[PDB]
């Protein structure tokens, strides 16, 4: 999976509460959630993000409460995936479950507004004439993302239909 | 004249009618045209294009109707320019007059979604660390484009005497 998009850059310790602050008390509605992703920390994000854009962050991206609405909001917006130095355990989980690709590594070389082409399988990020390498998700996880999330994964496989 | 953006690739014989359907020119608002650019052939283009992006096509880009709306729509969207193997004669003229730079050359090497930095004056297109060369508009034409089209060009360079 290779995508081309704009970098939306964030600092360290972005909490899931900052991803979906006000709307979010659970209204799973992907459409609605898309309207308030990063609504306070980055008011410009929600209305200007386009499919293929990438959320890039520093350390501990997605720490905090276990609200899956954060991952849902990003998915609803067509974000290509998330690149960070490290992720909050719960968010990482929710991103995979929802079907959002993730890359791990130093993000100091990526700035807000940068245009990049990301290969989510190899972790290769092309910026201008340079290439930044990140650790991609292992194959088992890419497979879950490829199917569109863990639920879709087991639905297609048939595990969901127990009887 | 250097821009960086994403390639939106199209094939051969793209008509101006495909760029802006004939049911949309009645407007003195280029922004309105921008909203319907390639609306029927590639619906996500108008909403997803960002200034600096480039339209790349095969041969005969811009044939068909002589209406300027096609070029107007692209410029309104902030499209950096058009790179094609060949252009419809009228579109070429309209592109210049409206104020959009053009590059001529083989485009098989550029794919939809490719990120490119384009030097519209030299024809140098940088894709990653790869360099593709195209034939640019000559300086006189680039000056008209650079100034914003033939009308703005004329306004700034006197000659306002018949």
From Swiss-Prot, chain B:
It comes from the Archaea. GO terms for molecular function: 3-isopropylmalate dehydratase activity. It holds the Pfam family Aconitase_C. Gene3D superfamilies: Aconitase, domain 4. Its EC number is 4.2.1.33. Pathway: Amino-acid biosynthesis; L-leucine biosynthesis; L-leucine from 3-methyl-2-oxobutanoate: step 2/4. InterPro entries: Aconitase/3IPM_dehydase_swvl, AconitaseA/IPMdHydase_ssu_swvl, IPMI_Swivel, LeuD, LeuD_type2/HacB/DmdB. One of its GO terms (biological process) is L-leucine biosynthetic process. Keywords: Amino-acid biosynthesis, Branched-chain amino acid biosynthesis, Leucine biosynthesis, Lyase. It catalyses: (2R,3S)-3-isopropylmalate = (2S)-2-isopropylmalate. Catalyzes the isomerization between 2-isopropylmalate and 3-isopropylmalate, via the formation of 2-isopropylmaleate. Heterodimer of LeuC and LeuD. Belongs to the LeuD family. LeuD type 2 subfamily. PANTHER family: 3-ISOPROPYLMALATE DEHYDRATASE SMALL SUBUNIT, 3-ISOPROPYLMALATE DEHYDRATASE SMALL SUBUNIT 2-RELATED-RELATED. This is 3-isopropylmalate dehydratase small subunit. It comes from Pyrococcus horikoshii (strain ATCC 700860 / DSM 12428 / JCM 9974 / NBRC 100139 / OT-3). The gene is leuD.
């Amino acid at each position: 999976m290779i995508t081309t998009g704009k970098v939306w850059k964030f600092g360290d310790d972005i909490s899931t509460d900052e991803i979906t602050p006000g709307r979010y008390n659970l209204t799973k509605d992907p459409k609605e959630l898309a309207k308030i992703a990063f609504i306070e920390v980055r008011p410009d994000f929600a209305r200007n993000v386009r499919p293929g854009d990438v959320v890039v962050a520093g350390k501990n991206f997605g720490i905090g409460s276990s609200r899956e609405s954060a991952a849902l909001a990003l998915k609803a917006l067509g974000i290509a995936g998330v690149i960070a130095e490290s992720f909050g355990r719960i968010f990482y989980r929710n991103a995979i479950n929802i079907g959002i690709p993730l890359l791990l590594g130093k993000t100091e070389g990526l700035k807000d507004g940068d245009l990049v082409t990301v290969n989510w399988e190899t972790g290769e990020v092309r910026k201008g004439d340079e290439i930044l390498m990140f650790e991609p998700l292992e194959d088992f996880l890419l497979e879950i993302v490829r199917e569109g999330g863990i639920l879709e994964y087991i639905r297609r496989r048939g595990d969901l239909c127990i009887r």
